[PDB]
Amino acid sequence: ATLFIADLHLQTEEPAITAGFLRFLQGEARQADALYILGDLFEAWIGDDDPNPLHQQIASAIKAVVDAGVPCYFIHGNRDFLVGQRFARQSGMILLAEEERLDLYGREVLIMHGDTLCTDDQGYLAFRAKVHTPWIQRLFLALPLFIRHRIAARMRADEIMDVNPQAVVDAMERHHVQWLIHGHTHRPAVHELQANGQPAWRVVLGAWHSEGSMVKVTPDDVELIHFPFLEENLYFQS
Ligand SMILES: O=C(CCCCNC(=O)Nc1ccc(S(=O)(=O)N2CCN(c3cc(Cl)cc(C(F)(F)F)c3)CC2)cc1)NO
Ligand SMILES: [Mn+2]
Numbered sequence: 001a002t003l004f005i006a007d008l009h010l011q012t013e014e015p016a017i018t019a020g021f022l023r024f025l026q027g028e029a030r031q032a033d034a035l036y037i038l039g040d041l042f043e044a045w046i047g048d049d050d051p052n053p054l055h056q057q058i059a060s061a062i063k064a065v066v067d068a069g070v071p072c073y074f075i076h077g078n079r080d081f082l083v084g085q086r087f088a089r090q091s092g093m094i095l096l097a098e099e100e101r102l103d104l105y106g107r108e109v110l111i112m113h114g115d116t117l118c119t120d121d122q123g124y125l126a127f128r129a130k131v132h133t134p135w136i137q138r139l140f141l142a143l144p145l146f147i148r149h150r151i152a153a154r155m156r157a158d159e160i161m162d163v164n165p166q167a168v169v170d171a172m173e174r175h176h177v178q179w180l181i182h183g184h185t186h187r188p189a190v191h192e193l194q195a196n197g198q199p200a201w202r203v204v205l206g207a208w209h210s211e212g213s214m215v216k217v218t219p220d221d222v223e224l225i226h227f228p229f230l231e232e233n234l235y236f237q238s
């Protein structure tokens with residue numbers, strides 16, 4: 001099986017999510033053929049030189065999955081688009097492009113974070129175009145870490161728009177797939193549509209708000225799975 005997760009929004013103020021992700025990496029992920037993280041792994045990212053201990057904790061945990069023989073891949077989200085090759089090396093993850101076509105047991109599947117499908121949010125797409133401009137990222141990353149932290153804290157102090165159905169069809173026809181997996185919108189669901197003259201499906205990951213969410217693709221099926229962060233020990237009441 002191949003696993004997909006997204007929209008964890010890890011942060012030191014939410015240790016329950018971190019614990020849930022560490023439990024996921026120690027258990028389920030170790031049995032996978034591959035793990036794809038489709039963006040928004042972190043609530044924020046201001047560059048790989050950030051000494052935030054959570055980053056090293058997460059990198060070590062992911063690296064243990066990689067060393068266990070499970071390749072891990074990352075597509076950037078709207079929150080963590082500055083994740084770079086230094087973190088990729090620390091974590092053992094492979095950085096992928098904003099759209100990737102996968103062969104999953106003979107099924108061609110398009111994966112992406114999903115924010116680029118939300119083409120009705122014209123203001124966001126303009127912001128996205130700016131912060132994905134390479135010379136702008138290079139200038140921001142050049143600023144001192146304490147400045148970047150102040151910029152980020154100020155900006156974060158300032159409802160997620162859903163996908164545009166025509167953008168979905170465009171993407172699945174550009175890639176000639178019948179299957180699309182994405183996150184970003186926080187509306188876990190399976191949508192049927194038509195692409196390339198045939199039925200097509202759009203599978204949406206959940207955010208890790210109160211429980212975890214993953215998509216698990218097998219040779220036989222596609223599974224959207226919700227599970228508790230921590231081991232829920234049963235006990236009995238007379
Ligand atoms: O609705 C939708 C979309 C949903 C809403 C999208 N909004 C959203 O993602 N906001 C946001 C994301 C990340 C952060 S951050 O804290 O991690 N961090 C802030 C500073 N960052 C920066 C980088 C560069 Cl290159 C340049 C600058 C500059 F020039 F501004 F200083 C700053 C790096 C990132 C802060 C806010 N879809 O339907
Ligand atoms: Mn998200």
Ligand SMILES: [Mn+2]
Binds near residue numbers: 007078079113183185
């Ligand atoms: Mn997002």
